[PDB]
């Protein structure tokens, strides 16, 4: 009787109570930017979070992958991916429409399309495409924004992280900060 | 259907019988 | 052949559902047979369209399989009853001499001893077995109470005192004796032992119950697979027909193992009866193959029985040659084995052929029980022989003297486990004759062998502590427990059964019946009577514990055969699974039809061939099972390696090719 | 591809091994009732204050202690979830859950399943999450580790009647095993980009005009404990694919190592406390062989991927349909097998999106009973049941008596073994059949054909085995699914842990004996192969019809 309730209360306090409070204090003390989401800020206005990703559908900007969230794309309040299997005709419909759209919007590009740009991510708050996908849609952005391919490639290489080990994570471009820097320039 | 419910009834009671027989050294 | 047909009739009688639920897997195939027959009936004559012939075919095959399995069981039971009758079938006719005017009387009515009631008076004379328990009221004799104690020394019952209660069954040796039946024929000592053996029932061997657990487990697994397999397939489209479902159930559940169980049993029975040791079932054979401690009886089990003369021990300067000559010429006329044994010992240990002749003028002086000593008077000599106290009385009465070292030798011969017979010639004790038991004949070396096999050895006897210690040490057993009444036998054997060690047993008298019965493996000898033979599973007319070493070896081999075929059944079953699955799955997704490996003709042909192969497994596995594979000694690791390799590869390959060739037969014959 | 993958699985196992080794030594110290180096006065004062003065427990008392702790936690978490509109730390004034959803969530978290039929971003409120779920994630892991401690003690204590102090085991296992390691990993995630704050949902205007409302609660803490304890219950809907939870590739790798840290170390420790490390190696080799075969299968299957994209126009043809871009198809496949075989439940990619084989292998790893490096505590005693059965059948087929690590295996222990090993597939098959046989459970599907059936099957397989993953297309928030899966998880957990305590109690009284002719070495490649055969055959025989009718039919189509 007594040990059950007692040890329960003690563990409840130390775990539910002490542990997250302690980790939160140390987090916001040592790494404050990260612990609060690591946002991009423009005065009071927050352009967005450096990790979540947004729904860029503008000509000059870079396109990530489609989200397929609950309400509207790249919605962070109802994250989730389209749980469509390969034996579903719906997937063959959606992918067909998407590849038609990308073929149209990008005349100066190959007939092939990086599979990544076509298929939906797992979370829908994906803000990462391999440098190849970003490379495939370079001439659209250059031609649209009156930029040069040289400096545009420099941008793509400047906002692309690498993992320490080369066989755990693929090379990844950051789309949010990339569109921001593009508009800055 | 009648046959389906009767079949599942038979299978259920049979599983009871087999688990009983298992726990025994009859 | 006759026994086989008798067994078939018995098996069809055993069809009775009340007896079907003894084994689980059998009742499963039973109820399956019932379901398919009902479906075949309603479909053929009623509201369910479909192929009635397929249902009737499958139903007949299932019924057939139950018949074959039950037939194997009936064959085992029939062979066991046949050997039981052949070994326990002998003529019996106990007789008693009822008397009138019971002082002595002379109206001897040859009334069967079983028909005697309390208060009735009986007469027994030399050689006639005591008809029933009771008391003595006139006459004094020396009963051979060897079935109660195990000893062979005649004990004096003398009509009034503390030696006045004879026992039914024991033999009388010396002279006449009238008995007063003081027990009812229903409450006799034999009935006490019968009540004990009847009250005791043997349990299943751990190796049996373990296999049973595994079988019921497989049963549950496959039952749940198929029973739930119905609605899964239903969802997709057309539901799997219930007929193929039940057929697949009985094809997949390990039915084969019960028939294989009985097959290995009869296999061991054949080998065992072929080794000059009859049994009651292969169950007892494996239990022999896992013996942990032996419970032996000193008298009638290790020793041949009926101990006879052995070694001479003279007194101070009495010319041992003279002692041997005196003993030889004295015990000449005797006919009991002890007298002839004294004669043989003396005659083969010295040269005295000249003196033995029965034409000489001597008045043979037989035993009297008044002076209590036998002997002879050849010429100016009075040779007498008998107990130490009898000759003490004789000497003290004849104005002589009884030396003390003679008594020292007497005490010694008593301590060595032998009854000492003092000898006299006039008024001078010549010495002692030690009637030691017969010999163990290499049992000490074989007990060392048992120790090498890590099998405990135990003794059971009703002799004095010192005698028991001496004879036990001379036997080489680890320890002993004397004065062990039958209830003590059971107490010890059950307190050891509490540890879980398989106990072995052997013994001859009526007193050893309960212990023999309770033990999972107990052999018997010819010295014992129906009380022996009827209690205990095993029997050995040779009465040589050596054979226990051999029979545990043979039991080892039988276990090995069981294990190997136990691998075959498993492999066969799982092979049936992977060989039949897609062939059955042919109603909803045709892609699974493309998945077939053996390419059977059709799902109907597939399931048909499957159940056919099922019954075939039973029947065609009987011969290879009863044959038995030769075993060679090996280590557990390599034993497993070899077992898996041979039987596993064979089994896993068999059902595939078997169902394939049966499919060839199906296609070329055109049954469907 | 094959070069990037071989390297990925190689370095994974090497690192895990190294960490599991000194850990194994520490858990061995804790199972010799020995206090850890510097904690022996703190422990005295703490136990005296809590009133847990040392006094051993037989198997009945131990079992009752564990079950009592679990039921108390269940009641507390249930009522907490129902009334979360009265408790503090609720920035978005969310209302209290339903009765069916609260029941399913309570049962799931208390039994280490962490099955999610809700959306954490719009359902829970920073307090059910903080003081309701993480507390459970500690107590559940501790209960599992307590049971296997009692089992290992049963194996090493000779002819006794004690099995340790339940409460001291829980207090040691939580305070000095989970909390510090977890806190360390929590600050690590915080550093990588994960989130840890008690702020309100932030307001965000995009570079264009669309309005985002980022959810922002205490995530790093829950992440660290949910992965180190193999719970698998995440803060957001996509439990581990979300960026705030698994931000960089490094964090993903630490998550996998943390997914195995404790079970691998318990195998080592069991190999040490018995004094013979050969036993531990035998166990580790068995599990690792199955693991490598499965990862190879899934990686290969998905690298081939969907063949239709090629014809529609895609440049490459790799099934990158439900997988984050931070990682590749290789890491996504590896993590799928790792979370499925380790009984964690955390998914980094949508499992419904894999090809047929990629859906067959993980599901099949769950069905066998979570024995390949299984759940923390639960997995090792699952594979003790299978090891005991393996010597039971080996000795039976060779014709000798079964003895393991000196102890003597009796019919009684075997009975219990069969009982437990069957209690899991019975729930699986019965639940899936019931669901498929009812319009309600049938309507939750989101994919036609046999794949639709695979959804229901996978759901119940996760529930019964406490895996916690799901194909996620199944809309399982209706009361039917909540009650069905609640019943499955509850009975799976406790139905499989009671017989383990029974077998532990039986073996604690047995005395170890010297070698004989019925003693086959259980270390070496002959018992390793014997055991793999046992597990795989048991599983295949029990699930071939479902599998044939589900993912395989989808595949061949
Ligand atoms: C129906 C079954 C059907 C059985 C059919 C399979 C049996 C075939 C196995 C025999 C090896 C054949 C030649 C062996 C001789 C050649 C030696 C060599 O080449 O090495 C290989 C070493 C041998 O050596 P060893 O053992 O280490 O010897 C010193 C230690 N004992 O096998 C090893 O390593 C491990 C591999 C051994 C295979 C066993 C693993 C699968 C077991 C499947 C059965 C599961 C149980 C069923 C449960 C329901
Ligand atoms: K889990
Ligand atoms: Mg005797």
XYZ file of C-alpha atoms and ligand atoms in Angstrom, chain C residues 214 218 566-572 574-575 636-653, chain D residues 389-390 393-394 397 521 523-538 541, ligand 1:
101
model
C 3.704 -29.786 -28.419
C 0.394 -27.069 -33.125
C 9.347 -37.302 -34.415
C 11.481 -35.179 -36.717
C 9.953 -36.831 -39.754
C 6.392 -36.032 -38.694
C 7.211 -32.371 -38.075
C 9.033 -31.963 -41.389
C 6.272 -33.777 -43.254
C 5.362 -28.260 -42.515
C 6.134 -29.486 -46.028
C 24.216 -34.974 -28.076
C 25.488 -32.210 -30.348
C 26.414 -34.628 -33.121
C 23.320 -36.681 -32.346
C 21.200 -33.626 -33.106
C 23.250 -32.835 -36.198
C 22.771 -36.312 -37.615
C 19.109 -36.533 -36.607
C 18.272 -33.222 -38.285
C 20.339 -34.030 -41.374
C 18.902 -37.461 -42.185
C 15.299 -37.253 -41.028
C 14.790 -33.529 -41.553
C 15.984 -33.528 -45.152
C 13.997 -36.677 -45.891
C 10.789 -35.316 -44.408
C 11.046 -31.802 -45.835
C 11.516 -33.325 -49.292
C 10.986 -24.022 -26.271
C 14.005 -24.571 -28.519
C 12.093 -29.612 -28.791
C 15.781 -30.261 -29.350
C 13.778 -34.983 -30.865
C 25.752 -26.968 -25.566
C 26.319 -21.916 -27.332
C 27.631 -22.328 -30.871
C 26.122 -22.346 -34.357
C 24.036 -25.443 -33.791
C 21.863 -23.924 -31.188
C 21.911 -20.606 -33.019
C 20.498 -22.345 -36.077
C 18.095 -24.408 -33.978
C 16.672 -21.265 -32.408
C 16.355 -19.299 -35.649
C 14.500 -22.288 -37.034
C 12.157 -22.374 -34.038
C 11.199 -18.704 -34.280
C 10.854 -18.478 -38.051
C 8.909 -21.707 -38.434
C 6.519 -20.955 -35.575
C 3.163 -21.551 -39.900
C 12.491 -30.117 -40.126
C 13.888 -29.459 -40.027
C 14.691 -29.750 -41.322
C 16.202 -29.814 -40.953
C 17.054 -29.604 -42.235
C 18.302 -28.744 -41.890
C 19.373 -29.640 -41.204
C 20.714 -29.450 -41.959
C 21.839 -29.149 -40.941
C 23.087 -30.053 -40.839
C 24.405 -29.297 -41.150
C 24.598 -30.351 -42.273
C 26.118 -30.627 -42.441
C 26.848 -30.295 -41.108
C 28.275 -30.907 -41.158
C 29.200 -29.951 -41.963
C 29.749 -28.862 -41.003
C 29.586 -27.450 -41.622
O 29.714 -27.294 -42.794
O 29.284 -26.341 -40.786
C 27.899 -26.061 -40.679
C 27.433 -26.274 -39.229
C 27.446 -27.763 -38.855
O 28.506 -28.031 -37.949
P 28.213 -27.912 -36.315
O 26.729 -28.055 -36.053
O 28.677 -26.559 -35.823
O 29.039 -29.099 -35.499
C 29.454 -28.824 -34.174
C 28.316 -28.115 -33.405
N 27.065 -28.866 -33.560
O 26.103 -25.848 -39.128
C 25.914 -24.532 -38.629
O 26.851 -23.854 -38.356
C 24.480 -23.975 -38.442
C 23.556 -24.489 -39.584
C 22.877 -25.817 -39.135
C 21.405 -25.817 -39.642
C 20.436 -25.799 -38.420
C 19.618 -24.475 -38.423
C 18.213 -24.726 -39.051
C 17.415 -25.726 -38.161
C 16.022 -25.988 -38.802
C 15.140 -26.833 -37.834
C 14.365 -25.874 -36.885
C 13.751 -26.683 -35.702
C 12.233 -26.893 -35.950
C 11.410 -26.216 -34.825
C 9.903 -26.401 -35.122
